[PDB]
C-alpha cells in the first residue's frame, strides 16, 4: 500500500533537483512552524545564546500527489528512506553553530499528503548570535532572534510565510530550564532583504528575555547597603579612637572594590 504509493510516485520521471511547478509560475510557498524546546547558555560576553527547536516546513509539490481527492486512500504516506524529494534549502542566517540530531535513526519526519502537500519536521540545535545592550544591565531586557531563509533560491522561486495559526510554539518545560531569565514575550516577523545576489525571503522569530532580579538583589544590592551601613557605625566611635574608624572605612571600601570586580 504505502510502499506501492511511494513506488508509483518515483517510478515516473521525478527530479528532486527541480523546483516544484506552480500554476501561475509563482514561487513555491513554504509555510513555517517553529517549536522551541529549550533556550540555554545565554552568553553575555560573546553575545550569543543556544537553543534547540523543531523546524516544521510545509509546501505543495503537485508531482508528489498520489491520492489527489483520495477518500479511498491513506490521507498521507510517510516518506521512507531512499526517496529523494525537493526541499527548501533553508538555513539560519544568524546561526554560528548548528547540529541535527541523529541518535539512532535521524530525527526527521516527511509526510507526502495525497494532494501533494509535504510536511517536513526536524530537530535542530543552534547557537545564535544575539547582540545585547547592557545600559541597564542589572535590570535589563534583551531580545534574541532566530532568522530563517533560503540560501540559493530567490524571491521568484521560494517564499516563506509563518503558519497562520500559532507559528511559534514553546514546549512546556522551557521556562523551567531557563532559571536566570523570564521569557516574557515572543513575536513572529519577516526579515526579507535585498542583497547583491538578489532578493531573498526571510522569517524571524523573536523572544524577549527579562533578567531575573532576585540574584542581583542578594549578591549586589543588599550586600552593598550592608557595606555602606557599616561605614556609618564609625560615626559613633569617639573621635579619639581613629584607628577604629580607619579600619572600618578602609575595609568596607576595599571590600566594595572586590565585590564590583
Amino acid at each position, epitope marked *: 500500500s504505502d510502499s506501492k504509493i511511494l513506488a508509483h510516485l518515483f517510478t515516473s520521471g521525478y527530479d528532486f533537483r527541480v523546483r516544484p511547478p506552480t500554476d501561475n509560475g*509563482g514561487p513555491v510557498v513554504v509555510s513555517v512552524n517553529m517549536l522551541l524546546r529549550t533556550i540555554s547558555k545565554i552568553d553575555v560576553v560573546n553575545m550569543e545564546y543556544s537553543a534547540q527547536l523543531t523546524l516544521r516546513e510545509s509546501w505543495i509539490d503537485k508531482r508528489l500527489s498520489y491520492g489527489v481527492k483520495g477518500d479511498g486512500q491513506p490521507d498521507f504516506v510517510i516518506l521512507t528512506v531512499g526517496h529523494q524529494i525537493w526541499m527548501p534549502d533553508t538555513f539560519f542566517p544568524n546561526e554560528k553553530q548548528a547540529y541535527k540530531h541523529t541518535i539512532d535513526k535521524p530525527n526527521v519526519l516527511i509526510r507526502i499528503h495525497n494532494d501533494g502537500t509535504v510536511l517536513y519536521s526536524v530537530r535542530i540545535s543552534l547557537v545564535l548570535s544575539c547582540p545585547m545592550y547592557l545600559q541597564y544591565y542589572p535590570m535589563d531586557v534583551q531580545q534574541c532572534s532566530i532568522d530563517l531563509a533560503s540560501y540559493a533560491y530567490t524571491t521568484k522561486d521560494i517564499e516563506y510565510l509563518w503558519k497562520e495559526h500559532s507559528p511559534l510554539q514553546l514546549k512546556v518545560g522551557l521556562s523551567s530550564s531557563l532559571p536566570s531569565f523570564q521569557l516574557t514575550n515572543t513575536s513572529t516577523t*519577516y526579515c*526579507t*532583504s535585498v*542583497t*547583491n545576489t*538578489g532578493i531573498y525571503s526571510c522569517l524571524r522569530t523573536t523572544i524577549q528575555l527579562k533578567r531575573e532580579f532576585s540574584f542581583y538583589l542578594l549578591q549586589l544590592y543588599i550586600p552593598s547597603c550592608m557595606l555602606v551601613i557599616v561605614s556609618w557605625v564609625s560615626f559613633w566611635f569617639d573621635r579619639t579612637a581613629i584607628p577604629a574608624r580607619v579600619t572600618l572605612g578602609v575595609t568596607t571600601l576595599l571590600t566594595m572594590t572586590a565585590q564590583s570586580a
Partner: antibody, heavy 122, light 110 residues
Framework: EVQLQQSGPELVRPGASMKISCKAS????????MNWVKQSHGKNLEWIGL????????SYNQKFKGKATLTVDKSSSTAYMELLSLTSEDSAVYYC???????????????WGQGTTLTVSS | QAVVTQESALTTSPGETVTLTCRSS?????????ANWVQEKPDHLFTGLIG???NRAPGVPARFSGSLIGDKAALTITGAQTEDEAIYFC?????????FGGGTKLTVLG
C-alpha cells in the same frame, strides 16, 4: 520629516540618454531601498526597478532590463536613474518611491518624489 | 501577462464607508502578492497607505484598512473624509516585480 526631491524636467532628442536624480533627506539614506515608478500617458503606472542604497544591489523589471540603470551616491544621499536609447515611448513622468522598512525589504511604499517629467521629442 | 483590475471610479459621501477592490487576472490575491495601495492627490502627489504583510506607511489615518475580501485585495475607508478624494492605485507583487492597477477615482461628494 523625510523628503525626496527629484531633478527638474528634461527635454531630449531620441537616441540620446539622460539621468534623473532623487535627493533624499530627513532619514538615514542608506537604510531604505528606493523604487522607481514610470507614469506615462499611454499606460498605467509601471514599476521599473529598485536599488538598495546600503548594498548597491539592484533588481529590475524584466521590461526595463537594459533601459534603466539604477545607481546611488551615498555621500550625497542621492539616487540616480539612467535611461538609455531614449525614444517616444520613454516620454513620461518618473517618480521615485521609498520602501517602508528599516534596513530590510518590506515591499510597501512610503514617500514618493514630486516626479520628473521627461520629454523625448524630435 | 498578469494584469491588475480596479473600479474605474467610485462615489461616497463624507462619513460613509467605501471599499475599493484590486483584482488579479492569474487568480485570487494571496498574501505573497503583498497588495499595496497608493494614493494620488491632484498635482502628482503620491503617498503609500498599506502594503507588505499587514503594515502601513507613517501617518496613514486609522480609517484606512486592508483586507482580502473574497479573492481580491480590498481597501476600506471607514468614515470617509473630504480630503480622502483622490486616485487610488493598488499594486500586486508577481514573483519579482510590481504590477499596478488602472486606479480608482474616489469622489467624496460636495
Amino acid at each position: 520629516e523625510v523628503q525626496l526631491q527629484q531633478s527638474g524636467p528634461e527635454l531630449v532628442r531620441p537616441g540620446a540618454s539622460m539621468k534623473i536624480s532623487c535627493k533624499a533627506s530627513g532619514y538615514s539614506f542608506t537604510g531604505y531601498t528606493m523604487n522607481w515608478v514610470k507614469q506615462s500617458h499611454g499606460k498605467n503606472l509601471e514599476w521599473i526597478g529598485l536599488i538598495n542604497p546600503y548594498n548597491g544591489g539592484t533588481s529590475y523589471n524584466q521590461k526595463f532590463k537594459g533601459k534603466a540603470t539604477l545607481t546611488v551616491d551615498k555621500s550625497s544621499s542621492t539616487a540616480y536613474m539612467e535611461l538609455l536609447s531614449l525614444t517616444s515611448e520613454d516620454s513620461a513622468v518618473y517618480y521615485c518611491a521609498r520602501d517602508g522598512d528599516y534596513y530590510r525589504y518590506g515591499r510597501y511604499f512610503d514617500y514618493w518624489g514630486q516626479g520628473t517629467t521627461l520629454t523625448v521629442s524630435s | 501577462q498578469a494584469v491588475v483590475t480596479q473600479e474605474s471610479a467610485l462615489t461616497t459621501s463624507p462619513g460613509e464607508t467605501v471599499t475599493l477592490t484590486c483584482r488579479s487576472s492569474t487568480g485570487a490575491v494571496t498574501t505573497i502578492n503583498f497588495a499595496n495601495w497608493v494614493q494620488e492627490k491632484p498635482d502628482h502627489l503620491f503617498t503609500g497607505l498599506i502594503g507588505g504583510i499587514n503594515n502601513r506607511a507613517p501617518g496613514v489615518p486609522a480609517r484606512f484598512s486592508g483586507s482580502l475580501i473574497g479573492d481580491k485585495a480590498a481597501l476600506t475607508i471607514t468614515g470617509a473624509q473630504t480630503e480622502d478624494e483622490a486616485i487610488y492605485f493598488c499594486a500586486l507583487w508577481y514573483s519579482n516585480h510590481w504590477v499596478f492597477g488602472g486606479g480608482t477615482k474616489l469622489t467624496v461628494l460636495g
